[PDB]
Amino acid sequence: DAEECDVQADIIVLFDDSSSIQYDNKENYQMMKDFVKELVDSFTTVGVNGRNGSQFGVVQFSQGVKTAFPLNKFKTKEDIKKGIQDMVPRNGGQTEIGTGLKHVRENSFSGAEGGGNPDKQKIVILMTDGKSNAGAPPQHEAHKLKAEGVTVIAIGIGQGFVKTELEQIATMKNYVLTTNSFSELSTLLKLVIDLACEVCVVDCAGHADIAFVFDASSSINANNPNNYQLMKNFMKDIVDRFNKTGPDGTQFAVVTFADRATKQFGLKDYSSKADIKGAIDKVTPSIIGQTAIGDGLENARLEVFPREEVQKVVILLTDGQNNGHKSPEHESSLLRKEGVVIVAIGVGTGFLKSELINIASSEEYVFTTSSFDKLSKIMEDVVKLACMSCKPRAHKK
Numbered sequence: 135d136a137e138e139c140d141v142q143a144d145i146i147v148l149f150d151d152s153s154s155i156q157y158d159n160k161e162n163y164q165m166m167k168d169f170v171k172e173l174v175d176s177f178t179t180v181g182v183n184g185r186n187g188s189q190f191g192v193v194q195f196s197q198g199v200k201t202a203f204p205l206n207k208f209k210t211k212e213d214i215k216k217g218i219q220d221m222v223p224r225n226g227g228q229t230e231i232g233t234g235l236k237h238v239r240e241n242s243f244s245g246a247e248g249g250g251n252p253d254k255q256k257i258v259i260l261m262t263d264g265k266s267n268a269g270a271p272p273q274h275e276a277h278k279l280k281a282e283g284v285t286v287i288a289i290g291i292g293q294g295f296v297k298t299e300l301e302q303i304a305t306m307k308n309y310v311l312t313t314n315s316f317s318e319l320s321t322l323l324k325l326v327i328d329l330a331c332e333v334c335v336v337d338c339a340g341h342a343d344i345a346f347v348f349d350a351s352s353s354i355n356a357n358n359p360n361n362y363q364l365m366k367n368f369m370k371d372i373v374d375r376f377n378k379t380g381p382d383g384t385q386f387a388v389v390t391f392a393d394r395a396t397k398q399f400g401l402k403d404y405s406s407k408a409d410i411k412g413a414i415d416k417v418t419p420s421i422i423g424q425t426a427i428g429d430g431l432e433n434a435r436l437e438v439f440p441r442e443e444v445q446k447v448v449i450l451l452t453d454g455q456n457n458g459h460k461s462p463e464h465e466s467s468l469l470r471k472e473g474v475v476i477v478a479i480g481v482g483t484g485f486l487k488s489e490l491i492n493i494a495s496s497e498e499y500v501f502t503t504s505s506f507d508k509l510s511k512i513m514e515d516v517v518k519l520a521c522m523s524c525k526p527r528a529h530k531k
């Protein structure tokens with residue numbers, strides 16, 4: 135039940151030192167410290183030599199931010215653990231999550247504090263018992279941080295944090311871990327190491343199973359008879375960006391939705407790009423003007439996904455709000471729990487962004503455009519996500 139990660143990394147822990155923690159229980163800080171010590175002892179290359187080594191730093195945040203120690207301060211696990219033990223919580227009267235994230239981006243990973251080595255994965259583990267209520271706006275700071283190639287894991291403790299805020303901050307919604315008490319932190323260790331050791335890269339030549347789940351309502355071609363073809367061209371252009379299709383590379387499937395959902399083709403129907411693109415083009419729209427986003431996702435879950443070890447992706451496109459036959463929140467949750475990464479795109483003024491946000495793996499994976507002609511504007515960003523390939527590297531000690 136104890137694991138390790140052999141990945142070379144610079145790891146920053148963002149450690150809430152708000153007064154709420156001390157008020158709740160005088161032993162809470164010790165339990166937080168112990169948890170962080172256990173993290174240190176989970177990374178095998180911490181304390182290694184020179185260029186094959188991992189580093190650890192800790193930054194306290196509540197009212198303002200204090201660096202407990204930088205990445206380059208200590209050189210062995212023991213010394214790092216002593217550093218953690220010697221930390222003095224400040225018991226601030228505010229919780230500035232965003233200011234913490236900003237400090238980490240601007241200082242913690244800088245050359246001056248020992249960061250910047252390109253062979254190293256950058257990881258931030260945030261621990262908080264509160265909601266951000268002052269300082270730099272957190273969603274924006276989290277965006278800039280992650281844009282620099284930083285993985286963000288968020289741990290929420292007790293009843294005072296808000297889960298959707300942590301979900302916006304973390305790399306994906308399932309990089310958020312929650313527990314009811316500081317006493318149970320240790321039950322999250324394996325999960326945190328598993329996420330920290332998840333290596334995600336952009337690789338359009340990898341093995342992936344990709345499902346387009348798209349709107350085929352009569353509404354699409356209402357204000358412009360080109361819309362449906364523009365949407366097909368967008369999907370065909372995405373297919374063309376993969377190096378190789380079929381069982382030896384990338385497999386594609388299509389599900390469409392209107393009042394209900396229909397599997398047009400599964401992952402094993404076609405192996406050539408020409409066949410995949412021609413199959414996309416043959417798909418006909420419904421004469422019904424409903425959009426069953428929930429049914430589309432259910433269909434992908436039950437009829438498309440059940441290749442093993444391969445990255446699974448759903449790219450969903452809609453021009454309307456859900457009809458309620460199935461719950462998009464529930465169906466997407468089930469898909470994401472199975473390892474499916476979900477990208478959500480709304481086109482026009484008929485969709486609801488809340489629903490896109492509910493189904494996507496992250497609000498960073500949500501895209502909106504005013505028209506089908508402007509799908510080209512989001513193409514590059516969508517491809518980078520469609521090509522994302524995540525590999526778990528943690529294993530038992």
Ligand SMILES: [Zn+2]
Nearest residue numbers: 138139140178
């Ligand atoms: Zn190992």
Ligand SMILES: [Zn+2]
Nearest residue numbers: 152154263264
């Ligand atoms: Zn607090």
